[PDB]
Amino acid sequence: SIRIFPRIAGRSYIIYGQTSGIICKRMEKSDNEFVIYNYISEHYDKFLKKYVPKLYGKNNDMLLLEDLTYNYNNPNVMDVKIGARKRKSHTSGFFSIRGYTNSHDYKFDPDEYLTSESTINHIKNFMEAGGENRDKTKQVLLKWIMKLSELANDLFEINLKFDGVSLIFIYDDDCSKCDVNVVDFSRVKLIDTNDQMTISAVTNLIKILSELADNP
Ligand SMILES: O=P(O)(O)O[C@@H]1[C@@H](O)[C@H](OP(=O)(O)O)[C@@H](OP(=O)(O)O)[C@H](O)[C@H]1OP(=O)(O)O
Ligand SMILES: Nc1ncnc2c1ncn2[C@@H]1O[C@H](COP(=O)(O)OP(=O)(O)O)[C@@H](O)[C@H]1O
Ligand SMILES: [Mg+2]
C-alpha cells in the first residue's frame, strides 16, 4: 500500500508513488510550495526545466514530483540547504549540509557548527562511495560545477527569496551519472530584487568543489 521514501533530511511525509519514477510529498502547513511551483512555471519556466524536478500534479495535499534518484543503480544523495534557515545561522557559514548517504558512518551531526576543514571533510566523505578512480570522481565534481555555475548566473535575474531551498547532489557508485537540482519551495517568497544570500551559498559551494576537483 504505502512504501516510505528514504529521505536524506527534512521532517516532511514523502512516500513512493503508486507508479514508477514518482514521489508523493505532503504539504504540511500551507499550499505555498504549489503556489511557488506555478509562479516559477509562469515567470521563469527555463529555471524550472533546468534546475527543478518536474511537478506532474497535485492530489489533495500531495505533490507528485519527479524522483531524482530513479534512474540510478546506486545513488549517493547529499542535501545542502543554500536558502536562509527559518531561524539559526548556517552550519558552514554560507550553507548547511543537512545530510548524505552513509553520513552515520562518519558521525555527521546536522546540528554541529563546522569549520571549513570539517565542511570539506564531510563533502570528501560523501564522495567516498564513488571509489578510488580519482579521474572519474573529478568528472562528477566538474559536471556539478558546470550546472552550479549556470544556476548562480541565472539566480541574478530571479526576484525570489529562496528561504529553505536545498541542493540535492546525486552520483551513481560507478560515477557514470550525476546531477544536482533545487528542491523545497515551501518557504519561498516574492521580492523586488535577487537573493544575494542564496547566490553566496552557490558560489561558495562552487569554490569548495573547484578546490576538490583541482587538489592532486
Ligand atoms: O516542519 P518541521 O518539522 O518543524 O521542520 C522544518 C524543517 O523541514 C526545516 O529543515 P529541513 O527539513 O529543510 O533540513 C527547518 O529548516 P531550517 O534548517 O531552515 O531551520 C525548518 O526550520 C523547520 O521548520 P520550523 O522552523 O517551522 O520548525
Ligand atoms: N524530487 C526528489 N527526488 C528525490 N529525493 C527528493 C526529492 N525531493 C526531496 N527529496 C528528498 O527529500 C528530502 C527532503 O526534501 P525537502 O523538499 O527538502 O523536504 P522538507 O520540507 O522535509 O525539508 C531531501 O533531503 C531528499 O533526500
Ligand atoms: Mg528541506
Automatic annotation (TrEMBL):
Signal peptide coordinates: none
UniProt GO MF annotations: ATP binding; kinase activity; metal ion binding
Keyword match ATP-binding: yes
Alphabetical GO biological process terms: inositol phosphate biosynthetic process
List of residues binding Mg(2+): 184
Binding site for 1D-myo-inositol hexakisphosphate: 29, 81, 85-88, 187
Binding site for ADP: 8-9, 11-12, 25, 66-68, 79, 184
Keywords: ATP-binding, Kinase, Metal-binding, Nucleotide-binding, Transferase
Binding-site list for ATP: 8-9, 11-12, 25, 66-68, 79
Domain of life where this protein originates: Viruses
Keyword Nucleotide-binding found: yes
The protein, known as: Kinase
Provenance organism: Terrestrivirus sp
Parent-protein start and end of this portion: 48 to 263 of 265
